[PDB]
């Protein structure tokens, strides 16, 4: 099974700031990295697929870049509402593996 | 690929007409040239280098130099005249690309 | 031979057609077919083509992401899913037939050397 | 002899959803030559021995021709599921025939990426063994009806495949060719040497 | 468009209990839906996946205690879970999977305790 690294965890960070969250895979995950966002007491929410492509609604300061093994989120512009957890999930092998998480 | 071909032939009628294809190591690729008279489909006038169709005159002859391929229309015909293009086929485009 | 043709109207922008292109007469499976759109009072473009074998040849740089090229050895029919039609797009579309050999280890190159009366569409 | 170099050999390739069915019959089907070529990574065969090929003769061979990705080889078998394998190329679960496949990254890999080849990933029901879906309509995924225009709930039923020369192995792009070996229902067309 | 879920409680170990997924604005005979357990301050784990076909694919820890179904009549999708043991007490969210796993929508959950 893939295993998604994600660091760093519990990033805390002030207001304006941008956070890039580096989610490592131990094989070869071409483009396919999605990340959620999960907040407190609520289902996750998915933000990027594809790892570049940003989904309908989700405000423009979210934005991903990376392919291969290694790929970066960043939610630039710290709104305070963006306070949640933040998953990678590879969905392209067959047992699809989240990521640690980190609470942003 | 940049198929350029000057849009003004005047040729007197009876004269020996030619049309030039402006195009970078155009000779190594294969010139196509076609014809489309008004309200009427396109015909293959000539498809390879100096090679021509069955059931056509005489007249259209072809020629691809190294850097310019030419089309040569000897003994004009009365009226015959309509807009003539050349083709080629880019591997590196990978798209036909007709001129104009 | 001939290439009856069909699916030609006016059709608003952003939405979507498609053209059929029936064949007869010549082997449908042992030719490659074109699709060339010809604005009014301009040259021709080529759209897409298909090899033999199914094989897409390849779409012109404006109709890359948008036009789809299908066809069917079965009945001779061949089709192009236009999609997401703008004002350029408003043209007359023929159905050329190329009458090059098979293509094999690479050496392509084609000459469309049978045409049909085209379907203009209108955006 | 036979035709089997034009299959083999195409400059290009037909896609998985609009996969090419080759019909061969009255030839000399030289099998042997096609298993002794170490170009072809896969040549699992079903139901019959890569030795019987020539010794057993058919009739009305078909060949289908299509690319995939590399991981997805596996899911063309009797007996698969996957999303190429439910709705766009499905074998029967008593397929007789060989599967051959060898990766081609050096010609269907574009720089750039290209919609040459694609796929179709959403269909309401699975396709019968040796069917073909060509149709191309905007799939709807709700109780509201979709017109022409695609947006939620309307999504297009291809997509394609990203095909680079960057991508790793499991990626890349593999030729697929499948020999069906349609029993003997008429007299005998496609013998070995 | 939503996904209502309901049927959690407390059920005794190696007892069986099955969920319900309701559905409005969507087919569940189609769009890939999905089920995704969330234990109690842990991360997510996929569970199941039905096509919009039939395939079913289940991760090897709920392989053959769990089945997965769907109810075209009233649009509702079900998760039956035949054997329970300590692990499986977690968080259960249905969702609309855009591609075999993107989940692109997700319900509101259910809450299950073995
Ligand atoms: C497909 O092509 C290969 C490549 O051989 C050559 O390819 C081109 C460069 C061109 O020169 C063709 O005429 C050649 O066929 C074939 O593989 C070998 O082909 C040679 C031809 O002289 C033959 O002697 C060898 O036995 C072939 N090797 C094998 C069969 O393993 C191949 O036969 C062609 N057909 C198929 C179905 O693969």
Avoid at chain 1, 47 to 75: C, H, K, M, Q, W
Avoid at chain 5, 11 to 40: D, K, T
Wanted: proline fraction near 5%; aromatic fraction near 12%.
């Amino acid at each position: 099974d893939i295993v998604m690294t994600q660091s760093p965890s519990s990033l805390s960070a002030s207001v304006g700031d941008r956070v890039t969250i580096t989610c490592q895979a131990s094989q070869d995950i071409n483009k396919y990295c999605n990340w959620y966002q999960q907040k407190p007491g609520k289902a996750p929410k998915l933000l990027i697929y594809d790892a570049s492509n940003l989904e309908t609604g989700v405000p423009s300061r979210f934005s991903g870049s990376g392919s291969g093994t290694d790929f970066t989120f960043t939610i630039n512009s710290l709104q305070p509402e963006d306070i949640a957890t933040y998953y990678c999930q590879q969905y392209d092998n067959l047992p699809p593996t989240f990521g640690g998480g980190t609470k942003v | 690929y940049e198929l350029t071909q000057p849009p003004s032939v005047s040729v007197a009628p009876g004269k020996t007409a030619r049309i030039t294809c402006g195009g970078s190591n155009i000779g190594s690729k294969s010139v196509h040239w076609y014809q489309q008279k008004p309200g009427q489909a396109p015909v293959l006038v000539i498809y390879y280098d100096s090679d021509r169709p069955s059931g056509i005159p005489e007249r259209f002859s072809g020629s691809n130099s190294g850097n310019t391929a030419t089309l040569t229309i000897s003994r004009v015909e009365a009226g015959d005249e309509a807009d003539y293009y050349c083709q080629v086929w880019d591997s590196s485009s990978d798209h036909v690309v007709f001129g104009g | 031979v001939q290439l009856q043709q069909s699916g030609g109207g006016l059709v608003q922008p952003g939405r979507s057609l498609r053209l059929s292109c029936a064949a007869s007469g010549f082997t449908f499976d042992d030719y490659a077919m074109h699709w060339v759109r010809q604005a009014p009072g301009k040259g021709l473009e080529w759209v897409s083509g298909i090899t033999w074998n199914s094989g897409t040849i390849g779409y012109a740089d404006s109709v890359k992401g948008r036009f789809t090229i299908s066809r069917d050895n079965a009945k001779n029919s061949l089709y192009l899913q236009m999609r997401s039609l703008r004002a350029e797009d408003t043209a007359l579309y023929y159905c050329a037939k190329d009458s090059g050999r098979k293509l094999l280890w690479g050496r392509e190159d084609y000459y469309m050397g049978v045409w049909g009366k085209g379907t203009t569409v209108t955006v | 002899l036979c035709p089997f170099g034009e299959v083999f050999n195409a400059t290009r390739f037909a896609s998985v959803y609009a996969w090419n069915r080759k019909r061969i019959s009255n030839c000399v089907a030289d099998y042997s030559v096609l298993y002794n070529s170490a170009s072809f990574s896969t040549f699992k065969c079903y139901g019959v021995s890569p030795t019987k090929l020539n010794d057993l003769c058919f009739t009305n061979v078909y060949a289908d021709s299509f690319v995939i990705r590399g991981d997805e080889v596996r899911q063309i078998a009797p007996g698969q599921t996957g999303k190429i394998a439910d709705y766009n190329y499905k074998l029967p679960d008593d397929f007789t025939g060989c599967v051959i496949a060898w990766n081609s990254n050096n010609l269907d890999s574009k720089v750039g990426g290209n919609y040459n080849y694609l796929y179709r990933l959403f269909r309401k029901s699975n396709l019968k063994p040796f069917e073909r879906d060509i149709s191309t309509e905007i799939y709807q995924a709700g109780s509201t009806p979709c017109n022409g225009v695609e947006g939620f709930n309307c999504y297009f039923p291809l997509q394609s495949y990203g095909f680079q020369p960057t991508n790793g192995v499991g990626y890349q792009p593999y030729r697929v060719v499948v020999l069906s070996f349609e029993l003997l229902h008429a007299p005998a067309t496609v013998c070995g040497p | 468009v939503q996904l209502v879920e309901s049927g959690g409680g407390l059920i005794q170990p190696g007892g069986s209990l099955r969920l319900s997924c309701a559905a409005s604005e969507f087919i569940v005979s189609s769009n890939y839906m999905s089920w995704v357990r969330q234990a109690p301050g842990k991360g997510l784990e996929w569970v199941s996946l039905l096509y919009s076909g039939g395939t079913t694919y289940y991760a090897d820890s709920v392989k053959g205690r769990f089945t997965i179904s769907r109810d075209n009549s009233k649009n509702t999708l079900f998760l039956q879970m035949n054997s329970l043991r300590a692990e499986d007490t977690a968080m259960y969210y249905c969702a609309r999977d855009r591609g075999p796993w993107l989940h692109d929508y997700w319900g509101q959950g259910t809450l299950v305790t073995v």
